Write a protein that binds this ligand. Structure first.
Ligand SMILES: [Mg+2]
Ligand SMILES: [Zn+2]
Ligand SMILES: [Zn+2]
Ligand SMILES: [Zn+2]
Lengths: 123, 83, 145, 99, 199, 95, 578, 570
RNA sequence: CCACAGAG
């Protein structure tokens, strides 16, 4: 029948398992221990990501009780900081259709995030 | 919403055969689910014949939405259709 | 199902109590009706009322909880012992006083008879009021009007 | 089944379906070809459009988007056969009442 | 303590209830749907206060029952954050005290974190005791009226598990889940204790 | 219809009609189904063969309209019940 | 209290969205991985082996087993899918033509589309018009492929692109081989690719100078692995020009090559219960699934152990042929397999033909509540009436719901029972779910306790609406709707005036009787397909239901000029007609 | 494994879902989602999936976002140079704006810490901590804000000495070539720019001109090529610091210009570092340092990584391809900056190098020793250097870079699949089309080892099977299979594989940071930071330690992947 | 699962 013919190197007992793992077994030579230079590199990468995340270019979104009482007063304010229209865009780098959404005549300001050379990560 | 008002209706006031069949079917199903009847039955024990008797003197409370082929329906009460 | 808004208005406990007892009267569920028809005699009229066991449980529980007195004495709430005109009088009294909507709701819902209760409801009373205002709170609330 | 020896039933063929179409009797055709022959209640997921079992989508691993409908069992057989053929019929659903 | 919620919904009136008034039929169906049940992210429904808008009854082909899109205002039990309410103490444990509202809502659990400093648990009497200077007589006795302030209400979805896992759990249980709506009370200042404490 | 004499055959229905299921049910089941799968063409269930296969009511004949049962609620029966607290609530002592 | 509000909204199917299952979609819907060629284990007396083609976790093929995924029986389980990972990818026979077409449009070296930027923009703009039909879309795609074929060199790399086509277009394995002639449109321009090719071939003929006759026949073969790796590095923005929507995660061309084969549920491939022996025969799909598993395991063993490349490629081709025949049986010759003659039944065979799913079980199907009987005339019956034998009316039942108007009638019918004619065969209580037979019960306490919501299946009685049909259905008047009458002679009887639309003659004609089971269907049948409402054929509007022969003759003889009647004979004639 | 693994377990812990994604789309979407918001991620995903798209098309394709959200998202992406735009006028007169995607801004987001470290290292501020901190701050702000004006940055500085130092550092950065004036050229696609220039210089030729159409197109494309070459090097004109004399003999950057980070110069530096790493494994240890000094001396004048003309779709003509090859070979040789002698390396040579006993010919920064080092660099098997004239050396990038790619790919293959796979790959590369028996003879190991290792090697486009059929109906039983090796297939596949691995690492990092949101949010607070030991439960602090350690390992492995991957982008 | 044989 169809099971009859087998190649030279295979035996009647080796076939039939058909076990193919979904997990790899060959690792690239890049998973070694951390050193100090790439430690500083990771610190710089984390600092850059944190700097971009709270900046004036972030659209992450894809309390809040209507009742008011005295304990709601004397509370920490909203503390709004650097909106989209606050940044002083160069008007020549943008299409004309994008002018209206951003503030072209609104008072503008620019924020600067300080850089910490020291390791801000605990480990 | 998209409902044509009760004066700008531009569909025929006659009641077609398919509307008659669907109205009698729905009314017979409602009667078979133990709904009250507004006509004096004389011992008829079949929902379809009771629905026919109800239609004969225009007592069915249903109305027909004639959907024009652009998304704007059109209300017609069964008591208003001529047949 | 789609909740258009979580909050449309506020309801004082008088409103829910009156609405619920009107529901009992219309549906023949009060203790008077059941003790007159099902109990104390045999039914002859056969006046079967509206049947809804979950609604029985929830309305009976809420009317019992609103009927009993609140945490101000160790016999009834007083809300069940006061009418619409008394409510109008109470809000005309309370409007001119330095209170918010939530605080007015809480004090009309609970009707405090204790000083410590009144200071518990309002927030930072000493930073807004003086002793005569607390006193006059006590007699206007104690009058149940 | 087929044949009166096996107590089978009569076949409403393609042209009988065509004649019932020609009359326009929608409800009678639906009763004859779905309700009285092979009606089957199935659970379909709204998110992915596939089919599930016992109120559970085997792909999304959730039950918040399961809608129970009724289809002919031949339709379910066709959908499972197509899914075996690496063809994915994803059903998109909308409410009967638009309001 | 009670709010009005405006909800749009689709109700089904069976043909046998056409003799009843249609407002009454809509109210009865909405009461079957909503009475004494948790509306998620809203609270606990009690009764339908009234109806605002009703549309024409649409009929599904293959059924005689009438479907109506109805918008209604319903009373909902939902204490806002800040309201103080009274209740009856039901049970005590080593993690907090449980208080009910005489059958309205028994899922109120005041934790250890927001109780008085120096509170401790007596298991032989199963009560909570707290002095201030020398008054050790303060007991959180069972079936006694208490006052408490709402501090945090939590909503959790049921999220049913796999049918094989549900079957396995059913087999292991016939040989359990957090309440979908819960409120955490607190007792921090004066007047937040029992009923027989301040008079 | 479509600007050219397309005729009534398997090569003409494939041009006149864009419904996947009807063309699959008529002739060349495998080829039409696989081409529909490859090109990812959505099929709108609006025809008659689609409605019969999927077991839902068609859009012609008695299915060409929706039957609606009238209700006897007037707008004057839907006046909202008064909210006593919100009516009586007024702010003068604060702002 | 503790339960959340449950809400249900009725829904209908808005539409289908055909696609191809990705690897993640195939595995995610799977329940068990098929990793053996053995269906049964001999230590449990032929039970389904775990991780086999037959497997409980897939479903059940017998009434006495359990699914172990929903723990249902045969009549309550929907079946579940398995998955099978092939050792090496193979071409899909259905998408093979599409694979050739998409290989004709991309660069065979860097995997980029063979279109200039402006022409690409123009074609994309012409596809996205707001009224594009299927025909216009197919025409624009064909023009895109024509332009891609007309390109000679890729715009992203200096690579010569030839022609991509089939190998031999036969019934054998060569039907599933793709070749790419690089140097077809080369002329004498002496491309560097030609220099590289002639250098390699001079090098290889430096050792074996007998393959010179086979140099011309050597083109760039596109094995399925190379095709998969070429599709994997295609640009996503180029998928639209090839007719594939890439917004969905399964919109890549890589989905159109077999990497994971979904094992079907055993519900749609049921093992035969018994064939004159306790042994169970298997459907051809299960045997092919076991063969595919064996071949994949053999290929993996050869790969990780080390076998001659001729044998490895031979087994790759055998796996491809096995999968292709598992999908479409007549695509390949069964003799090309080493095992093999009756052709097997594939999925394409199950979906095509007069006995396929589409024309045999979906467009039309066998229905319940029907009867087939020889016909005979009955002139004393009204034209809107058909006579049914009582021996049939005792079997065909109408399910009537108990109401306030027919409670006494249905109580009397239940009391009568299923033996006398006016009566019932089954009763279904309102709260219950399984019908109780109206033969073993008391039949009296059931009648007294008849609720107002129960459904009783009464016998077919007078005045009931029945569809009545003759099998050759040329026009819509071949099926009509009559009122039932009950007569004791074992033959359907219809008035001869209704013979003409049926084209029926009483010479052994067998005609069919359908009984609708819902009120809506019954009303629609009687008010649309009734004999009274269909006196005119819609072809021309002329009457087609009228006096047939032997009614015209007698009417003529009565209306003859020289026929005269006195009071007695005239009165008798008038009495006979009414 | 010891137990069967259900498909639920496979879909849960294994990354089977991520394997079905296009590596380009996966990497770009993950980078934008990690750095910018989710709306920007969806916009970039739609732009990658469907090519160029109008704002109305972006509104229609992305549900849940209106025109205002799409427009502000496009502004946010355009500020960080992650979206290229172009205005098109219809024939009727309609105006439309098509937004593209560009690898420039995305790679800038990808190479961020690497760019900062390269700026810190390459301007010899390794011994001035204050200037190092200022340089790091200004470069981080430049990358974060994309393009900024100098005067508005100086408005955030309230010390005159700090302002002077920052201005000096800006002038130094512009002089070194790490900051350029951003313009509309950086926002237009190269293909459309070449199309516009070609059409302008083609229609300029008058109609009914007395020459053939092929000659017309050839002349037009030569003129367009000259104009395009003039357009491209405009940021390299060094006119950004021409404003002089605010005080006595001072040069400063222009105040109103907008400066941005130059990606091409950074990639040139990365090419230099890759070449130094290649040279470190072939000749010497101080020879590599001499080569490093030579490359860092002529780094700024080196030809660009990618010849942008090649990306114009002009390679469809073989003549244009060989012209590109010849011009690329000529520019790296005849550019005056690139050529150097032994003497020019003596000035910049560090004092720590000795070079005295480095070489033994028989068995103090001297020029002859430098000449010998340059000669042995030139006289190696790998062409690191070449001599146009004696005493003159230059780096032959065109003939060196394919060698670098081949060596890196071969060593990747070795470190993955054993040295036997590397040996077989090199043997197949040497004998361009080789049978199995010739491999068996010419590579000395067992035949089954060859069969197994080449069966492994087929899966990665390393070796191509060429089928020679000796019959009409092709079949493996009656055919012979030869093996070849194509560089482009293997390089493209390895590039895609490394890109997918980078994207998968970023996805795992983002999931890890997402599922520990509460503790991480409590940790990175102004009050909590520094007082982590005091304000955290010990198990919570340990969880913070493991989370941070995992994130740092992720970024280290990403840096190593980038080093391994940038070789194939050249 | 096929193939005969009849009935329209
Ligand atoms: Mg005949
Ligand atoms: Zn799903
Ligand atoms: Zn099952
Ligand atoms: Zn190419």
């Amino acid at each position: 029948n169809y099971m009859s013919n087998l190649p030279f190197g295979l035996g009647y007992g080796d076939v039939g398992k058909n076990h193919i793992t979904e997990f790899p077994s060959i690792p690239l030579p890049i998973n070694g221990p951390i050193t100090n230079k790439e430690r500083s590199l990771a610190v710089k990468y984390i600092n850059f990501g944190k700097t971009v995340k709270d900046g004036p270019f972030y659209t992450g979104s894809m309390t809040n009780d209507g009742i008011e009482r005295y304990s709601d007063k004397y509370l920490k304010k909203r503390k709004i900081g650097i909106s989209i229209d606050d940044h002083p865009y160069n008007l020549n780098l943008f299409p004309n259709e994008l002018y209206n959404v951003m503030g072209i005549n609104k008072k503008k300001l620019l924020a600067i995030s300080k850089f910490n050379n020291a390791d801000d990560v605990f480990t | 919403e998209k409902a044509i008002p009760k004066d700008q209706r531009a569909t025929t006031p006659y009641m077609t055969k398919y509307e008659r069949a669907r109205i009698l079917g729905t009314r017979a199903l409602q009667i078979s689910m133990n709904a009250p009847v507004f006509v004096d039955l004389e011992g008829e024990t079949d929902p379809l014949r009771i629905a026919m008797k109800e239609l004969a003197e225009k007592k069915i409370p249903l109305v027909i939405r004639r959907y024009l082929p652009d998304g704007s329906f059109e209300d017609w009460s069964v008591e208003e259709l001529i047949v | 199902m789609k909740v258009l808004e979580e909050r449309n208005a506020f309801l004082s406990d008088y409103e829910v109590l009156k609405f619920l007892t009107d529901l009992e009267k219309k549906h023949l569920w009060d203790q008077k009706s059941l003790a007159a028809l099902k109990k104390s005699r045999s039914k002859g009229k056969q006046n079967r009322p509206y049947n809804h066991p979950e609604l029985q449980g929830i309305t009976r529980n809420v009317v019992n909880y609103l009927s009993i007195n609140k945490n101000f004495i160790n016999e009834k709430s007083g809300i069940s012992k006061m009418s619409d005109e008394s409510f109008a009088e109470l809000m005309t009294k309370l409007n001119s006083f330095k209170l918010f909507k939530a605080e007015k709701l809480q004090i009309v819902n609970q009707l405090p008879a204790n000083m410590v209760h009144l200071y518990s409801i309002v927030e930072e009373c000493d930073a807004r009021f003086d002793e005569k205002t607390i006193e006059e709170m006590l007699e206007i609330i104690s009058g149940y009007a | 089944t087929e044949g009166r020896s096996r107590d089978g039933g009569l076949r409403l063929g393609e042209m009988e379906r065509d004649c019932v179409i020609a009359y326009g009797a929608s409800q009678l055709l639906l009763e004859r070809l779905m309700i009285s022959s092979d009606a089957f209640e199935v659970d379909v997921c709204d998110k992915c459009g596939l089919m599930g079992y016992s109120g559970w989508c085997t792909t999304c691993k959730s039950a918040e988007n399961i809608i129970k409908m009724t289809i002919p069992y031949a339709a379910k057989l066709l959908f499972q056969e197509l899914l075996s053929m690496n063809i994915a019929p994803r059903l998109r659903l909308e409410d009967i009442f638009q309001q | 303590m009670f709010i009005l919620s405006k909800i749009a919904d689709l109700v089904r009136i069976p043909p046998d209830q056409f003799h009843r008034d249609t407002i009454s039929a809509i109210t009865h169906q909405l009461n079957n749907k909503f009475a004494n049940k948790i509306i998620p992210n809203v609270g606990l429904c009690i009764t339908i206060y009234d109806l605002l808008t009703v549309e024409e009854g649409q009929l599904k082909p293959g059924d005689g029952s009438s479907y109506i899109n109805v918008t209604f205002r319903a009373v909902v039990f939902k204490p806002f954050l800040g309201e103080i309410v009274t209740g009856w103490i039901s049970k005590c444990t080593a993690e907090g005290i449980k208080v009910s509202l005489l059958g309205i809502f028994d899922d109120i659990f005041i934790p250890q974190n927001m109780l008085f400093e120096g509170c401790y648990y007596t298991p032989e009497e199963s009560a909570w005791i707290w002095p201030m200077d020398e008054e050790t007589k303060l007991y959180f006795d069972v079936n006694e009226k208490i006052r408490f302030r709402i501090e945090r209400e939590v909503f959790v979805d049921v999220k049913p598990k796999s049918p094989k896992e549900r079957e396995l759990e059913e087999r292991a249980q016939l040989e359990e889940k957090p309440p979908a709506y819960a409120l955490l009370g607190s007792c921090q200042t004066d007047g937040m204790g029992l009923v027989s404490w301040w008079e | 219809y479509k600007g050219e004499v397309l005729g009534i055959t398997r090569f003409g229905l494939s041009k006149m009609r864009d419904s996947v299921l009807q063309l699959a049910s008529f002739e060349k089941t495998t080829d039409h189904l696989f081409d529909a799968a490859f090109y990812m063409k959505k099929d709108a269930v609006e025809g008659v063969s689609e409605c019969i296969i999927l077991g839902q009511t068609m859009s012609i004949g008695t299915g060409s309209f929706k039957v609606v049962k009238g209700t006897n609620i007037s707008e004057k029966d839907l006046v909202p019940k008064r909210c006593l607290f919100e009516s009586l609530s007024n702010e003068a002592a604060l702002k | 209290m503790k339960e959340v509000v449950v809400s249900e909204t009725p829904k209908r199917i808005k539409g289908l969205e055909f696609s191809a299952l990705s690897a993640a979609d195939i595995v995610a819907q799977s329940e068990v991985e098929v990793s053996t060629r053995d269906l049964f284990d001999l230590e449990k007396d032929r039970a389904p082996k775990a991780n086999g083609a037959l497997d409980p976790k897939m479903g059940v093929s017998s009434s006495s087993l359990e699914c172990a995924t929903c723990h249902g029986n045969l009549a309550s389980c929907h079946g579940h899918f398995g998955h099978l990972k092939l050792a090496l990818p193979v071409f899909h026979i259905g998408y093979f033509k599409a694979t050739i077409q998409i290989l004709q449009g991309i660069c065979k070296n860097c995997s980029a589309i063979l279109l200039s930027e402006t022409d690409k923009r123009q074609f994309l703009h012409e596809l996205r018009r707001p009224g594009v039909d299927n025909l216009r879309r197919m025409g624009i795609l064909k023009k895109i492929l024509d332009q891609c074929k007309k390109q000679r060199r890729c715009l992203h790399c200096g690579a010569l692109n030839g022609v991509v086509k089939k190998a031999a277009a036969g019934a054998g394995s060569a039907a599933l081989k793709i070749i790419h002639d690089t140097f077809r449109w080369v002329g004498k321009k002496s491309a560097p690719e030609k220099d590289i090719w002639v250098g390699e071939w001079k090098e290889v003929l430096a050792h074996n100078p007998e393959l010179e006759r086979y140099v011309k026949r050597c083109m760039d073969d596109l094995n399925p692995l190379k095709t998969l790796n070429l599709f994997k590095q295609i640009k996503s923005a180029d998928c639209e020009l090839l007719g594939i929507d890439a917004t969905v995660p399964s919109g890549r061309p890589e989905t159109y090559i077999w990497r994971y084969l979904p094992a079907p549920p055993v519900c749609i491939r049921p093992s035969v219960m018994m064939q004159d022996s306790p042994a169970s025969n298997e459907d051809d799909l299960t045997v092919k699934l076991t063969e595919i598993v064996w071949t994949s395991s053999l290929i993996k063993a050869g790969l990780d152990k080390g076998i001659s490349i001729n044998n490895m490629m031979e087994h790759w081709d055998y796996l491809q042929l096995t999968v292709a025949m598992y999908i479409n049986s007549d695509s390949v010759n069964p003799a090309m397999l080493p095992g093999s003659v009756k052709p097997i039944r594939g999925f394409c065979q199950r979906l095509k033909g007069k006995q396929g799913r589409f024309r045999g079980n979906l467009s039309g199907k066998r229905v319940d509540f029907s009867g087939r009987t020889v016909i005979s005339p009955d002139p004393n019956l009204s034209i809107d009436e058909v006579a049914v034998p009582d021996r049939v009316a005792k079997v065909l039942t109408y399910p009537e719901k108990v109401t306030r108007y027919n409670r006494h009638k249905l109580q009397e019918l239940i009391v009568n029972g299923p033996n006398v004619h006016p009566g019932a065969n089954y009763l279904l209580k309102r709260n219950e779910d399984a019908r109780r037979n109206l033969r073993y019960g008391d039949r009296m306490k059931l009648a007294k306790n008849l609720q107002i919501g129960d459904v009783v299946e009464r016998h077919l009685e007078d005045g009931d609406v029945v569809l009545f049909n003759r099998q050759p259905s040329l026009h819509r008047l071949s099926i009509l709707s009559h009122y039932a009458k009950i007569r004791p002679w074992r033959t359907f009887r219809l008035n001869e005036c209704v013979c003409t639309p049926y084209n029926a003659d009483f010479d052994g004609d067998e005609m069919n009787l359908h009984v609708p089971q819902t009120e809506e269907a019954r009303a629609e049948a009687i008010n649309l397909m009734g004999v009274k409402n269909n006196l005119l054929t819609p072809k021309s509007g002329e009457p087609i239901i009228a006096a047939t022969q032997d009614f015209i003759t007698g009417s003529y003889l009565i209306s003859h000029k020289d026929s005269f009647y006195d009071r007695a004979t005239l009165t008798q004639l008038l009495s006979m007609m009414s | 494994s010891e137990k069967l693994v259900t498909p639920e377990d496979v879909m849960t812990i294994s990354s089977l879902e991520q394997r079905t994604l296009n590596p380009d789309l996966f990497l770009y979407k993950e980078l934008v989602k990690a750095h910018l918001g989710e709306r920007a991620a969806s916009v970039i995903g739609m732009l990658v999936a469907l090519g160029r798209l109008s704002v109305r098309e972006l509104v229609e394709k992305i549900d849940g976002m209106d025109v205002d959200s799409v427009k502000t998202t496009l502004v946010s992406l355009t500020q960080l140079r992650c979206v290229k735009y172009l205005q098109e006028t219809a024939i009727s007169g309609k105006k439309t704006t098509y937004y593209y995607y560009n690898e420039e801004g995305i790679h800038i987001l990808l190479y961020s810490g690497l760019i900062i470290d390269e700026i810190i290292t390459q301007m010899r501020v390794n011994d001035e901590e204050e200037h190092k901190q200022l340089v790091a701050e200004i470069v981080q702000n430049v990358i974060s804000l994309g393009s900024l004006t100098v005067e508005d940055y100086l408005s955030s500085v309230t010390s005159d000495s700090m302002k002077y130092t920052i201005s000096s550092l800006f002038v130094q950065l512009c002089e070194m070539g790490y900051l350029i004036q951003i313009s509309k050229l950086h926002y237009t696609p190269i293909e459309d720019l070449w199309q516009f220039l070609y059409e302008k210089h083609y229609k300029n030729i008058p109609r009914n001109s007395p020459l053939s159409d092929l000659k017309k197109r050839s002349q037009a494309k030569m003129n367009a090529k000259t104009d395009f070459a003039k357009i491209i090097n405009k940021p390299n004109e060094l006119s950004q610091i021409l404003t002089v004399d605010p005080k006595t003999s001072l040069r400063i950057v222009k105040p109103t210009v907008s400066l941005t980070i130059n990606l091409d110069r950074f990639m040139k530096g990365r090419r230099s570092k890759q070449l130094i790493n290649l040279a470190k494994t072939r000749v010497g240890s101080v020879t590599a340092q001499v080569y490093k000094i030579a490359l860092r001396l002529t780094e700024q004048k080196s030809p660009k990584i990618r010849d942008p003309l090649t990306q114009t779709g002009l390679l469809q003509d073989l003549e244009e391809a060989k012209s590109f090859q010849d011009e690329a070979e000529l520019v790296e040789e005849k550019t005056p900056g690139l050529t150097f002698n032994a003497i020019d390396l003596a000035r910049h040579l560090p004092a720590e190098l000795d070079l005295r006993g480095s070489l033994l010919s028989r068995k103090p920064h001297s020029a002859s020793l430098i000449n010998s080092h340059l000669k042995i660099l030139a006289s190696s098997n790998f062409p690191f250097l070449n001599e146009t004239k004696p005493g003159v050396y230059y780096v032959p990038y065109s003939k060196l870079m394919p060698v670098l790619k081949s060596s890196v790919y071969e060593y990747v293959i070795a470190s993955t699949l054993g040295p036997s796979a590397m040996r077989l790959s090199r043997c197949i590369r040497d004998n361009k089309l080789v049978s199995e028996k010739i491999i068996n003879s010419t590579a000395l190991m067992k035949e089954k080892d060859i069969r197994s290792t080449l069966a492994s090697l087929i899966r990665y486009n390393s070796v191509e099977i060429q089928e020679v059929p000796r019959t009409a109906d092709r079949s493996a039983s009656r055919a012979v299979f030869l093996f070849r090796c194509k560089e482009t297939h293997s390089y493209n596949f390895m590039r895609q594989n490394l890109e997918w691995n980078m994207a998968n690492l970023l996805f795992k990092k983002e999931k890890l940071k997402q599922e520990n949101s509460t503790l991480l949010k409590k940790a990175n607070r102004d009050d909590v930071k520094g007082r982590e030991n005091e304000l955290l439960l010990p198990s919570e602090l340990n969880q913070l330690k493991m989370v941070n350690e995992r994130e740092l390992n992720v970024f280290a492995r990403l840096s190593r992947l980038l080093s391994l991957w940038e070789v194939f982008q050249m």
